[PDB]
Amino acid sequence: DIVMTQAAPSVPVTPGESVSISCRSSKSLLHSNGYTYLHWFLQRPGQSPQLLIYRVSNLASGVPDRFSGSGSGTAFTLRFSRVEAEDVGVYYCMQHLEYPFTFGSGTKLEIKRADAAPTVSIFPPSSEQLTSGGASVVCFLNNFYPQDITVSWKIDGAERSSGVLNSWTDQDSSDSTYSMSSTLTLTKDEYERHSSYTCEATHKTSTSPITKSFNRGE
């Protein structure tokens, strides 16, 4: 099979500036008929892929003028004249010359913006869940930047690593921030063996961790 390679797993860019993404094929994509069968696709978070450029440099219907493509044989480039925050997503190249048709691994465009401290909210188990014998403590760490953050759970001061479920949103297409959800899953019995539950978040925006907590006995 023809192997499509997209070296960069991601590429950081600031809104307003130009950027380019590369793709390489293991075999020339030039067909006997003179055409080069290489296409570019965009896949926004939670959406299906969509055609951006076909046959190296032809912009598809509805694709913004800021996109352009170049290349030949085995080296191709996708270019943005002015990147916008809404451009977040994964960009893939695909060869449409031989079967099996194959795709590159994709390059995620990451938007650079100003640092933003997370808005941290902690939630005690709901009364409904408790009646059901469960006790999940939820912590939301919303709209922060950069993307990396560390979350630690403390029960009566002691750290807890097991029973923690974490999930992260893709970069926001409007404000370019990231959000995270962390859930400490305990049984009602366990929950009642302690009183202080803390969601401790460490982010580059502060030397001291952002602490949110509550007491069960309250």
């Binding site: 795709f103 909210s121 059901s132 939820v138 939301f140």
Partner: protein, 220 residues
């Protein structure tokens, strides 16, 4: 408006069978070649199969891993393409998309919304929906509320707030699989002047189990 709509996806038993359908509209389906492309982690986008138009003898081509197990077909009278999948394996799990190469080319110009195929022997289980309300009084500030959707299978579940009226400050997180069951959370942030004066409800739907739950977030 060109449109491709998949259906027939969902949970399927390993070794079982499932037939995906794709209805086309908005373009000349009979002149197009139609393809199925799937997506899974640690594989990204993967071409699956293609059926050519009548002029090109309705020829079919399949990727190596599904040859002999999958069968692609089309019914031009219904502008639909199908993917009959047999002896399904774990590796077949993922989002399946219908895409076409219209009469004048342009690679895969049109794509459907995708249908999730989950190959698993686990049973369909409805979610439990819990309201997440602040543990203290707010504040002219912003307040964050949430919804915990736990213990369901398979994906997906849809979460809205106030039937869709609240979407701007919403963050619905990717589901996380625990002991054979998914747990997902969604947060919504609104002015302290909005809640609790106005009702803020989480509407959860789990198509697989036909579950629908409305949970009102009430101050604790």
């Amino acid at each position: 408006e060109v449109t491709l709509q998949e259906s027939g996806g969902g949970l399927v038993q390993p070794g079982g069978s499932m037939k995906l359908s794709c209805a086309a509209s908005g373009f000349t389906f009979s002149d197009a070649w139609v393809d199925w492309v799937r997506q899974s982690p640690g594989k990204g986008l993967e071409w699956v199969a293609e059926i050519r138009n009548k002029a090109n003898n309705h020829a079919t081509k399949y990727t190596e891993s599904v040859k002999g197990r999958f069968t692609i077909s089309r019914d031009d009278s219904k502008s639909s393409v199908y993917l009959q999948m047999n002896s399904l394996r774990a590796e077949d799990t993922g989002i399946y998309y219908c895409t076409s190469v219209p009469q004048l080319g342009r690679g895969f110009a049109y794509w459907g919304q995708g249908t999730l195929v989950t190959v698993s022997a686990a049973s369909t289980t409805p979610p439990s929906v819990y309201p997440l309300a602040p543990g203290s009084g707010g504040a002219g500030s912003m307040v964050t509320l949430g919804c915990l959707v736990k213990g369901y299978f398979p994906e997906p579940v849809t979460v809205t707030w106030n039937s869709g009226a609240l979407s701007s400050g919403v963050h619905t997180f990717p589901a996380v699989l625990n002991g054979d069951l998914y747990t997902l959370s969604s947060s919504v942030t609104v002015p302290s002047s909005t809640w609790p004066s106005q009702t803020v409800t989480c509407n959860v739907a789990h198509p697989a189990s036909s579950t629908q739950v409305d949970k009102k977030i009430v101050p604790k």
